[PDB]
Amino acid sequence: RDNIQGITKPAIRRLARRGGVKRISGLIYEETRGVLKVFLENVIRDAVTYTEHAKRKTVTAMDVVYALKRQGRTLYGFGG
Amino acid sequence: KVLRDNIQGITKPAIRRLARRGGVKRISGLIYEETRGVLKVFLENVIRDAVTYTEHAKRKTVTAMDVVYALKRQGRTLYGFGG
Amino acid sequence: KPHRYRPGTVALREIRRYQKSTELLIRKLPFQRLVREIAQDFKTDLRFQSSAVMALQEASEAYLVALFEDTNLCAIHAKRVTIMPKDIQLARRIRGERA
Amino acid sequence: KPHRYRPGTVALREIRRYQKSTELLIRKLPFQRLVREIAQDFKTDLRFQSSAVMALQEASEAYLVALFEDTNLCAIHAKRVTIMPKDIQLARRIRGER
Amino acid sequence: RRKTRKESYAIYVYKVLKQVHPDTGISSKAMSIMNSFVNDVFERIAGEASRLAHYNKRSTITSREIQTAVRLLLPGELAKHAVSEGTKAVTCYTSAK
Amino acid sequence: RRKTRKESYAIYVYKVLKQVHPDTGISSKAMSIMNSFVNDVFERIAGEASRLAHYNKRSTITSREIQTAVRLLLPGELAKHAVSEGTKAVTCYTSA
Amino acid sequence: MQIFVKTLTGKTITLEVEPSDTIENVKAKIQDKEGIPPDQQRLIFAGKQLEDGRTLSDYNIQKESTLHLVLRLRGC
Amino acid sequence: KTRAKAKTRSSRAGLQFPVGRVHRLLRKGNYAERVGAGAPVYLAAVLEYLTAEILELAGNAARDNKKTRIIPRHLQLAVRNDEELNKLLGRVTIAQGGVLPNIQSVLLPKK
Amino acid sequence: TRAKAKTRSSRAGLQFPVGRVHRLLRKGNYAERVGAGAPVYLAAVLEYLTAEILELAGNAARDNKKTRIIPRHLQLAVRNDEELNKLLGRVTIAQGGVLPNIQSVLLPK
DNA sequence: TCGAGAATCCCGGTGCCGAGGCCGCTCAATTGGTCGTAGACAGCTCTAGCACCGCTTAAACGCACGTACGCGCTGTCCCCCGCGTTTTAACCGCCAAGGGGATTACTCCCTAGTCTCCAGGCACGTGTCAGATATATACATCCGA
DNA sequence: TCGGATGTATATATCTGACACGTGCCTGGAGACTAGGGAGTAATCCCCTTGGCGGTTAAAACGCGGGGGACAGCGCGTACGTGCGTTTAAGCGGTGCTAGAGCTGTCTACGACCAATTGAGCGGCCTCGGCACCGGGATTCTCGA
């Protein structure tokens, strides 16, 4: 299950272009994939811990907001 | 008594010693003024918070607890002076 | 002769076009699959609400955009125009994220 | 004829010596005068406890040392050995300050 | 069909909007964002006031704690205007009865 | 004319130190640092547990809240060892 | 010295001031001449808001300069 | 023994935000043992002022773009273009916002 | 008649005061009611953390052939361990100092 | 310097769904009254923060000289960029099945509150040794020839 | 490539100020009992998540020519490091003084608590206008000459 490869190169190019980059080297993609993997790992671990404490089986939208707020990355507009 | 022109008390060798502890090797001739500005801004913020903390309690002497609380408010907490 | 643009024009056109709009940039289904695969390691047989996946996507895209902006600044400081992995590493080191 | 070291040796000696010790570097009385002068603008006729001044000095010194470390990294990144004000500006911009 | 009641600041935000801009609407996402903003600010101010009251070994939260928390949290011009508005509102409430 | 009583954590820290290293002393400023550290960690854990209890529409904090707050705050290995210590202590206290 | 103020009602009011005048003084003047209480009116000059704690001289209002008057509901 | 007609606490203070709801939330939020009779008024006034400022800026931005409704893009544009409001919401991401349209000067084409 | 008193800390087999922790939890305005098991858990966790840090600092002190612990030893113990450094990433210790590292580029040829 | 193509924006007609407003009703904010204690005010006592004066000596300052590095310029080589053609899977619409989230009622037991008793932790006083200084010496390291 | 000169680590004596420990005691923690509501448990409803099938079309993957950017090498001169003689003010050690922080009493005004009740706010329905979409033409750019 190598689903990390689903983040195609043109998507990363679009993200960089919105960021304001004009020229991109050929080795940025692996670094970007690693960074995204680490970030998702941390956030999802916190959300799953909240869900486990709540004694449920489906993670809701609220505990994702709580996990994001814990790391000082508050999010607006999703029922906070 | 009113004080004036005390920012220059931070001499060039003192900044050089701080940089040497920081691991630097060669220093350009324009670093000192920029460092003087940065330190002034930092102290201005911290003292601003501390004076408000002191004023809420109807006191007239700034205490170390006020400084500790002001530092903690900005996410740079300090150990070794109580609280 | 076929009409070609000099290398660089389409890049600026894309910059303007993509920082004018406010849509998402990653396809939904691959991201959902990645989220499920990552979350599988922590607890088996889980379920997700769609809004949770949407929130995760929004947060991830915002983080990546900010990181790329900082990387571009780092690249420009060194008298270059192309971003490189060392710029990302330096930005993450200064930000205090990487140990 | 007098014995002279090449430019660079004493810098490393100072680096080692000041990374081995822990005492403060900025003198006391100038710092106290600076603190009083800065605080004068918020409320006149104020008095200070000595421990407050000591804590302020400790925090300021730690902040300056960390900033200089980051500045050295920025200067090294661009194939250079001498630090320059633009390095400080870039470090402060990246850190998230205005 | 039984449905639980949920509370929100929607109607008050709409009242303020119709007070400031006579001819302008608002969408649902903007309303959610404003609700989150109001809740976040409320939580921050209340927490700071509680901490400040605890520091001075007192057991009551009054308008003075709110004033000092506002002065501690907001930047300059916002703090000045907010302090003025709060003092005016408190005086108006006290005078009337 | 005696002063008021100031609480502290010095006695228990000294006992733990004598338990780990039987022949090592400690100076005053290190004790102050340790006191501040203990107080700060206590405050963090208690606040996290309070917020966690508030989220779930509950009106009491039990050992489960403390365990989950410890899991959230501390990194991996420290979290595992602290969880083991806490559950062992609670079981021993209940048994007697 | 004379400033034109374009009001929201389509009427322009002429105010006699000095370059060193303060905003509380001009607010007293508009109180005297129209009676609209001071907290209700804001002035816009060159796209910049006029604040009470400053001097007309800081905002650089000169001869035949015009201002825009705006009104916001602020009951009691 | 004729109870007088009710008057909401928000009406006495000339406000719009509900004083009673704020008072109940302060009482039940585990902030302090007892709550004074002046704090909710101050809190409501401050919240009303901040909301009014944000809405004013967002409405100006929306009218600039020949539209009669406010969408999150207008809120983002209003917030990010004011230094004090930007400093207040430093670590907050707002959904469907986007980014401010800037391009580094050196990247621009030569001549 | 009555029986002699035995402290709850003795029952749990700890070195930290359970009763003081319970009182601080009750008076700290954290919740309406406080359970009877939370103080034991909190005391155990705090004791574990204190023991770990003290062991590392004592080892550092014994390295420098000294009998007492000074704040520099605490700084060295904290900064040389990964998880402890992560836990205290935004804390400055008075009289601490720094770690002796020099970038490889600056070294003489 | 000038001119032929592409990409973008302004304008007009049209259709759809969600934003604004209207009823009905149930729960929470008001009004009125009582009672207990939290804190505001006034007085007293003792500490530590401010001011000063003199002397010593370490640190800051100014100056001369030499050299190593920051920077501009030139050349090479190769690796991203723009464009065309083929492949593929994302998205949209529809249809089924059922697990798990969300209420509701009932009952046992866990914690708050009160009283009585006593011992553990804190402030105070005292001794003595761990270590910070001073002195002398052996060794590691740097720059020239 | 060796060898002289300088700075640092090693070993010994010594005397002080902080650390470790013994007492008195008094306030906070422990033992015993009640009562009352918070939470666990069993039962019911139905909503939203998971799964599958077909098409269709836009987006991704592959390949190719080439121009512009990354990087190495070199010359120059200027700013910065090192050392020396001179001048300045920080640091230590006392001496006086008084403003102000901290504690103790007391006494009242303010906030918690409870019963009746009524109007503010929330959920369901619907209806039409503001915005999205498609087609067309004017405009503004780029890149060859």
Numbering used by the authors:
A (entry chain F): 23 to 102
B (entry chain B): 20 to 102
C (entry chain E): 37 to 135
D (entry chain A): 37 to 134
E (entry chain D): 26 to 122
F (entry chain H): 26 to 121
G (entry chain K): 1 to 76
H (entry chain C): 9 to 119
Authors' own words:
The nucleosome is the fundamental organizational unit of chromatin and comprises two copies each of histones H2A, H2B, H3, and H4 wrapped by ∼147 base pairs (bp) of DNA. The nucleosome contains a conserved cluster of negatively charged residues in histones H2A and H2B, known as the nucleosome acidic patch, that is a hotspot for interactions with proteins that regulate transcription, the cell cycle, and the DNA damage response.
To investigate whether H2BK120ub adopts positions that could interfere with the binding of proteins that interact with the nucleosome acidic patch, we determined cryoEM structures of nucleosome core particles containing Widom 601 DNA (147 bp) and ubiquitinated histone H2B-K120. In H2Bub position 1, ubiquitin sits nearest the center of the histone octamer core, and progressively further away in positions 2–4. The secondary structure elements of ubiquitin in H2Bub positions 1–3 were sufficiently resolved to unambiguously position and orient the ubiquitin within the electron density maps. The ubiquitin in H2Bub positions 1 and 2 occludes large portions of the nucleosome acidic patch, as is evident when viewed in projection. Ubiquitin residue R72 is also in a position where it could potentially interact with the acidic patch, particularly in positions 1 and 2.
